[PDB]
Amino acid sequence: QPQAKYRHDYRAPDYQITDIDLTFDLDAQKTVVTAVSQAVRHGASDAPLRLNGEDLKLVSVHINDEPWTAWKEEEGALVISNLPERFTLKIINEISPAANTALEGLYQSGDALCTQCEAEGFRHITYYLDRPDVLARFTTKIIADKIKYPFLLSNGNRVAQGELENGRHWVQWQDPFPKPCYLFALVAGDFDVLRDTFTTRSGREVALELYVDRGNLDRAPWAMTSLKNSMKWDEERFGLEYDLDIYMIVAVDFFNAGAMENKGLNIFNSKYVLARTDTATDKDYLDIERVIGHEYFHNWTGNRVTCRDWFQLSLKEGLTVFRDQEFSSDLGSRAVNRINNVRTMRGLQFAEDASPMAHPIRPDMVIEMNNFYTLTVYEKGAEVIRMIHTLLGEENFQKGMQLYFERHDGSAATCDDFVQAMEDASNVDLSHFRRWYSQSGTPIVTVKDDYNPETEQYTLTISQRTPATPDQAEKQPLHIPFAIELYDNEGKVIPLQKGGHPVNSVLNVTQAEQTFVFDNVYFQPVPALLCEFSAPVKLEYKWSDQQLTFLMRHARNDFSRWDAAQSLLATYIKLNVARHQQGQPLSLPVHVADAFRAVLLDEKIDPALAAEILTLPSVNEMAELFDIIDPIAIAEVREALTRTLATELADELLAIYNANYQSEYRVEHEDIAKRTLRNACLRFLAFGETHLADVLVSKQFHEANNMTDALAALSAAVAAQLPCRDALMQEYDDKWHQNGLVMDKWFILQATSPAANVLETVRGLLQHRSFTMSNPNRIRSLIGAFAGSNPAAFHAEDGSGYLFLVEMLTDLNSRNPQVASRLIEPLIRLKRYDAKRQEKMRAALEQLKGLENLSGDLYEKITKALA
Numbered sequence: 103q104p105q106a107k108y109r110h111d112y113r114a115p116d117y118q119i120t121d122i123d124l125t126f127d128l129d130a131q132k133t134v135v136t137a138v139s140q141a142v143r144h145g146a147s148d149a150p151l152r153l154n155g156e157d158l159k160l161v162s163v164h165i166n167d168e169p170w171t172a173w174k175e176e177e178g179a180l181v182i183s184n185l186p187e188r189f190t191l192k193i194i195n196e197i198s199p200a201a202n203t204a205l206e207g208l209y210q211s212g213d214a215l216c217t218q219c220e221a222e223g224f225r226h227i228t229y230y231l232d233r234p235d236v237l238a239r240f241t242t243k244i245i246a247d248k249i250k251y252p253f254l255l256s257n258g259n260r261v262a263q264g265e266l267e268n269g270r271h272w273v274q275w276q277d278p279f280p281k282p283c284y285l286f287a288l289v290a291g292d293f294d295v296l297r298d299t300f301t302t303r304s305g306r307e308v309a310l311e312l313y314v315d316r317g318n319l320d321r322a323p324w325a326m327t328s329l330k331n332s333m334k335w336d337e338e339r340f341g342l343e344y345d346l347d348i349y350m351i352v353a354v355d356f357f358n359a360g361a362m363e364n365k366g367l368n369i370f371n372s373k374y375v376l377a378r379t380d381t382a383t384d385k386d387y388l389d390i391e392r393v394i395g396h397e398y399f400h401n402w403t404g405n406r407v408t409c410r411d412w413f414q415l416s417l418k419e420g421l422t423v424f425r426d427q428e429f430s431s432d433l434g435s436r437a438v439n440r441i442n443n444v445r446t447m448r449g450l451q452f453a454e455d456a457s458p459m460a461h462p463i464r465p466d467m468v469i470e471m472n473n474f475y476t477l478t479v480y481e482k483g484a485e486v487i488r489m490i491h492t493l494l495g496e497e498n499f500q501k502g503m504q505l506y507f508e509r510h511d512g513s514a515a516t517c518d519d520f521v522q523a524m525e526d527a528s529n530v531d532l533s534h535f536r537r538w539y540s541q542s543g544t545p546i547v548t549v550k551d552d553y554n555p556e557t558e559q560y561t562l563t564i565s566q567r568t569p570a571t572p573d574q575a576e577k578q579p580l581h582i583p584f585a586i587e588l589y590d591n592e593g594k595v596i597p598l599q600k601g602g603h604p605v606n607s608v609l610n611v612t613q614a615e616q617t618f619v620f621d622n623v624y625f626q627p628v629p630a631l632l633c634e635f636s637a638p639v640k641l642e643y644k645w646s647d648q649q650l651t652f653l654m655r656h657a658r659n660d661f662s663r664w665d666a667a668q669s670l671l672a673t674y675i676k677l678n679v680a681r682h683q684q685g686q687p688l689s690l691p692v693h694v695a696d697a698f699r700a701v702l703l704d705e706k707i708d709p710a711l712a713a714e715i716l717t718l719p720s721v722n723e724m725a726e727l728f729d730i731i732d733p734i735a736i737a738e739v740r741e742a743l744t745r746t747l748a749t750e751l752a753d754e755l756l757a758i759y760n761a762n763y764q765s766e767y768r769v770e771h772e773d774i775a776k777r778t779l780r781n782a783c784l785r786f787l788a789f790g791e792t793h794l795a796d797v798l799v800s801k802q803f804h805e806a807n808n809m810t811d812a813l814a815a816l817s818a819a820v821a822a823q824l825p826c827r828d829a830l831m832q833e834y835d836d837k838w839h840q841n842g843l844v845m846d847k848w849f850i851l852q853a854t855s856p857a858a859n860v861l862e863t864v865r866g867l868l869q870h871r872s873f874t875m876s877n878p879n880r881i882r883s884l885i886g887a888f889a890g891s892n893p894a895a896f897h898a899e900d901g902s903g904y905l906f907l908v909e910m911l912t913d914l915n916s917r918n919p920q921v922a923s924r925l926i927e928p929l930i931r932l933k934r935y936d937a938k939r940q941e942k943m944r945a946a947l948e949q950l951k952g953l954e955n956l957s958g959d960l961y962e963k964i965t966k967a968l969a
């Protein structure tokens with residue numbers, strides 16, 4: 103069952119493989135793989151070649167065409183001894199795509215065959231040096247039944263093709279860029295193809311090809327459009343062009359993650375490709391955009407420069423997430439992007455950094471590498487890259503990117519290499535900054551202020567510390583870029599300065615405790631603190647309600663207005679959760695409701711921003727405010743708050759809802775912002791007088807000319823338990839049952855229902871005609887949404903949620919351990935809950951620990967959780 107691997111153990115490989123020639127005789131039941139690799143020894147003469155392989159049937163081994171006798175198979179490996187220094191290795195083996203339920207390696211997605219090799223899936227295809235610092239030039243020949251698999255795709259360009267007897271054919275591909283094997287891809291199947299072209303700024307014409315299941319071609323143009331937008335943006339912002347002749351994307355229905363950046367042949371979860379205005383929401387459109395961009399941006403940050411080892415995952419993922427965010431932000435509402443990314447950081451990643459699974463963005467220890475494709479590596483990773491950007495500014499940051507590619511193009515690099523490039527290009531010292539790579543947990547930054555009217559000085563006294571996490575007992579101060587702005591009482595910025603000279607508004611918070619003194623502060627300021635969430639930290643500062651509403655009215659950056667609103671609410675969320683636990687109803691000062699009233703009626707606020715201020719923090723974001731989480735109190739308080747605001751703001755809500763009506767549906771940023779505001783008003787309106795609400799919601803649902811508006815109405819019906827809910831839910835089922843992606847939204851609504859009988863409805867749905875345990879998207883929509891997005895039901899006092907999740911994980915552990923491990927995450931958070939909950943959650947985890955054939959993926963999490 104073991105065994106953890108450790109970053110500090112990295113060693114350069116004893117052998118390299120420079121070129122690999124693959125042939126697949128493809129069949130669902132039995133695929134024959136022939137792999138001819140050119141190998142070179144780099145380590146000691148007597149070192150055996152250790153190849154990784156899993157679930158392979160070895161047929162033969164030859165070395166320079168000599169059948170080899172000096173080898174043995176061991177657990178996960180083929181160990182070949184007594185080799186020359188350079189030689190040709192030839193392996194023949196068999197695998198069975200149809201048996202592959204874990205969806206790693208070569209597997210079946212409906213009638214298609216496709217691959218997923220990151221992290222360590224290639225070893226499920228043949229015996230190989232399945233480690234990302236081994237880089238080979240691939241040539242791939244695919245042979246298959248012509249009728250079942252008319253399209254035979256791999257990385258690169260087509261260099262040969264032929265027909266064979268018995269209705270077979272083949273295509274051979276060649277990719278000139280050396281690659282680690284996690285970037286190998288193969289697809290075989292029968293597809294509709296949308297083809298288009300992008301012309302790079304230096305005049306290279308790239309053929310673009312999007313492969314979708316037959317009948318899905320009508321849902322492809324947005325994705326193709328987003329790809330072109332991605333290519334253009336990476337040229338304009340980063341100076342990067344695509345480096346091949348063709349760019350293929352294949353949308354498949356059975357896929358564990360969102361998508362995969364395989365060189366020239368990305369494979370996508372169809373969730374992040376398929377859109378039409380009646381099937382997909384504005385959010386889907388902007389997610390498709392994000393993820394198409396992300397995989398495209400990987401071509402440089404990931405493919406042209408790869409990872410020395412898997413502990414360096416954030417080198418590509420943090421950076422590529424930063425890039426997808428800058429892309430979304432440049433194209434759309436930068437404020438909305440930042441706000442949402444901050445909501446994700448505070449509401450979801452902070453929770454992980456306080457969990458038993460906590461790790462630094464560059465982990466030190468890993469048992470199952472698929473457990474480290476995390477909010478931390480990705481989202482916190484990007485926040486770290488963004489801190490570098492904050493510290494260097496754009497021009498220097500882009501010089502660091504240039505030095506990074508100039509030094510590392512065509513190699514496997516480390517996080518440390520990236521930091522060094524940024525430091526050397528910029529001349530900004532990032533020694534201390536590197537500690538963000540090696541330390542887990544969320545720093546807490548404590549600020550106290552003092553204004554001195556005699557000296558006309560404002561002084562901030564800033565402290566930091568990070569609590570211990572289960573993985574690390576010593577913690578040390580980080581280099582926290584801590585952006586401020588100071589406002590006079592009319593809302594003007596006060597120049598920051600000291601002893602005659604300008605001071606940078608990004609303060610360098612590097613120690614446990616420091617003081618910063620600003621001079622020439624003629625009037626007592628109101629500060630904005632941690633502007634743009636300039637570091638991924640908790641901020642402890644004793645805001646007055648009035649300072650916060652002042653900021654809501656006057657802060658220069660849209661984000662600071664939002665964030666001031668969140669700090670205003672936070673006090674009253676905490677108040678009312680304590681009240682709720684004593685049986686006391688919601689209490690909200692009049693002046694708080696008035697601050698949201700003012701936002702509804704301020705004509706000068708960008709509606710994109712108004713919408714976000716009028717979107718209350720989620721139950722996950724609310725949970726981050728507390729030492730011990732009470733999910734039932736949080737959920738009832740969020741409901742009560744919503745009903746309070748609905749009552750107090752009813753007329754203003756209706757007015758803004760009506761004013762933002764749009765007869766034309768467009769996927770355009772201004773339109774989206776208006777719709778988002780409209781629908782934010784709708785959420786409150788749904789909790790007004792019952793009949794009025796029922797009529798308004800039902801009308802939106804029935805008269806919508808797009809899925810954004812239909813879903814928002816259905817969601818509101820569900821959330822407020824309106825009388826129309828059952829009829830609208832049944833209508834959506836009747837209309838959409840045949841469409842998995844669209845039914846996923848309905849599964850989410852079912853799983854997150856506040857109805858008393860939600861669990862029972864969810865169990866029933868395991869037999870629904872649109873549900874299947876074979877499909878990860880369906881799993882995550884129904885089961886995962888219950889456990890992870892309905893904490894109130896998941897954490898029902900009778901413990902029924904935990905038992906339900908145990909039953910589901912008991913199946914998934916064997917079927918698909920990666921989706922199992924995603925779904926176990928809520929149970930591993932047990933120590934945030936009260937003792938009675940902890941006790942039932944430990945018991946659920948102890949049941950799981952006892953499973954016959956416990957996957958490594960779950961073993962890792964369960965062990966940390968029970969510690």
Ligand SMILES: N[C@@H](CCC(=O)O)C(=O)O
Nearest residue numbers: 359360361362363397475
């Ligand atoms: N492969 C990623 C998603 C997309 C990406 O990181 O490139 C994951 O498995 O979570």
Ligand code: NA
Nearest residue numbers: 123124125136
């Ligand atoms: Na071959």
Ligand code: NA
Nearest residue numbers: 175176178179
């Ligand atoms: Na073996």
Ligand code: NA
Nearest residue numbers: 220361362363
């Ligand atoms: Na990836």
Ligand code: NA
Nearest residue numbers: 363400404405
């Ligand atoms: Na990559």
Ligand code: NA
Nearest residue numbers: 431432434436
């Ligand atoms: Na923008």
Ligand code: NA
Nearest residue numbers: 470472958959
């Ligand atoms: Na595994």
Ligand code: NA
Nearest residue numbers: 220221472920
């Ligand atoms: Na994976």
Ligand code: NA
Nearest residue numbers: 715717718719
């Ligand atoms: Na809000």
Ligand code: NA
Nearest residue numbers: 453722725726
């Ligand atoms: Na949380």
Ligand code: NA
Nearest residue numbers: 435710771775
């Ligand atoms: Na906008």
Ligand SMILES: [Zn+2]
Nearest residue numbers: 396400419422
């Ligand atoms: Zn990625």
